[PDB]
Protein backbone atom coordinates (compact mmCIF):
# COMPACT_ATOMS: atom_id res chain seq x y z
CA UNK A 317 0.00 0.00 0.00
CA UNK A 318 0.84 3.63 -0.63
CA UNK A 319 -0.63 6.31 1.55
CA UNK A 320 -1.26 9.92 1.00
CA UNK A 321 0.38 12.13 3.56
CA UNK A 322 -0.42 15.81 3.90
CA UNK A 323 2.17 17.93 5.63
CA UNK A 324 0.95 21.23 7.10
CA UNK A 325 3.30 23.86 8.40
CA UNK A 326 0.89 26.02 10.43
CA UNK A 327 3.29 28.83 11.12
CA UNK A 328 4.32 29.29 7.56
CA UNK A 329 0.95 28.39 6.16
CA UNK A 330 2.36 25.76 3.73
CA UNK A 331 0.95 22.47 2.61
CA UNK A 332 2.74 19.61 0.90
CA UNK A 333 1.21 16.41 -0.38
CA UNK A 334 3.47 13.31 -0.51
CA UNK A 335 2.91 9.63 -1.21
CA UNK A 336 4.35 7.19 1.31
CA UNK A 337 4.80 3.40 1.12
CA UNK A 338 3.47 1.51 4.11
CA UNK A 339 6.99 0.34 4.77
CA UNK A 340 8.79 3.68 4.59
CA UNK A 341 9.07 6.29 7.37
CA UNK A 342 7.37 9.58 6.72
CA UNK A 343 10.57 11.57 7.06
CA UNK A 344 12.44 9.55 4.45
CA UNK A 345 9.69 9.82 1.89
CA UNK A 346 9.28 13.57 2.39
CA UNK A 347 12.99 14.10 1.72
CA UNK A 348 12.96 11.87 -1.30
CA UNK A 349 10.10 13.87 -2.65
CA UNK A 350 11.80 17.22 -2.10
CA UNK A 351 10.60 18.45 1.22
CA UNK A 352 13.15 18.81 4.03
CA UNK A 353 11.75 18.48 7.56
CA UNK A 354 13.48 19.05 10.82
CA UNK A 355 15.38 16.22 12.48
CA UNK A 356 18.35 15.55 14.72
CA UNK A 357 18.60 12.04 16.15
CA UNK A 358 16.60 10.26 13.37
CA UNK A 359 15.97 7.53 15.80
CA UNK A 360 12.79 8.37 17.72
CA UNK A 361 14.62 9.51 20.69
CA UNK A 362 14.28 13.20 20.64
CA UNK A 363 11.66 15.82 19.93
CA UNK A 364 13.13 17.51 16.89
CA UNK A 365 11.03 15.65 14.32
CA UNK A 366 7.74 15.96 16.16
CA UNK A 367 4.58 16.52 14.35
CA UNK A 368 0.90 16.40 15.41
CA UNK A 369 -1.78 14.25 13.84
CA UNK A 370 -4.82 16.05 12.44
CA UNK A 371 -6.34 12.87 10.95
CA UNK A 372 -5.26 9.31 10.14
CA UNK A 373 -3.11 6.85 11.92
CA UNK A 374 0.54 5.91 12.03
CA UNK A 375 2.70 3.14 13.40
CA UNK A 376 5.53 4.66 15.50
CA UNK A 377 6.45 1.65 17.65
CA UNK A 378 10.14 2.28 17.13
CA UNK A 379 9.83 5.59 19.08
CA UNK A 380 10.96 6.00 22.60
CA UNK A 381 10.74 9.68 23.49
CA UNK A 382 7.04 10.32 23.80
CA UNK A 383 5.07 9.12 26.75
CA UNK A 384 1.66 7.51 26.52
CA UNK A 385 -0.18 10.75 27.19
CA UNK A 386 1.71 12.58 24.46
CA UNK A 387 0.88 9.81 22.03
CA UNK A 388 -2.71 10.01 22.94
CA UNK A 389 -2.69 13.73 22.37
CA UNK A 390 -1.62 12.85 18.76
CA UNK A 391 2.12 13.65 18.84
CA UNK A 392 4.28 11.68 16.39
CA UNK A 393 8.07 11.48 15.79
CA UNK A 394 8.17 11.71 12.03
CA UNK A 395 11.57 10.13 11.69
CA UNK A 396 10.29 6.73 12.82
CA UNK A 397 6.66 6.86 11.85
CA UNK A 398 4.96 4.64 9.22
CA UNK A 399 1.63 5.74 7.90
CA UNK A 400 -1.09 3.11 8.39
CA UNK A 401 -3.80 5.16 6.56
CA UNK A 402 -3.87 8.43 4.63
CA UNK A 403 -2.70 10.95 7.19
CA UNK A 404 -2.81 14.70 7.76
CA UNK A 405 -0.10 15.96 9.99
CA UNK A 406 1.13 19.26 11.36
CA UNK A 407 4.88 19.47 11.25
CA UNK A 408 7.34 21.56 13.22
CA UNK A 409 5.68 20.90 16.58
CA UNK A 410 8.72 20.35 18.67
CA UNK A 411 7.81 23.45 20.64
CA UNK A 412 4.47 22.17 21.84
CA UNK A 413 5.90 19.91 24.29
CA UNK A 414 7.45 22.56 26.46
Ligand code: FES
Pocket residue numbers: 354355356357358359360361362363364365366381393394395396
Ligand atom coordinates in the same frame (compact mmCIF):
# COMPACT_ATOMS: atom_id res chain seq x y z
S1 FES B 1 14.77 13.29 14.94
FE1 FES B 1 14.91 12.60 17.02
S2 FES B 1 12.92 11.68 17.33
FE2 FES B 1 12.86 12.26 15.21
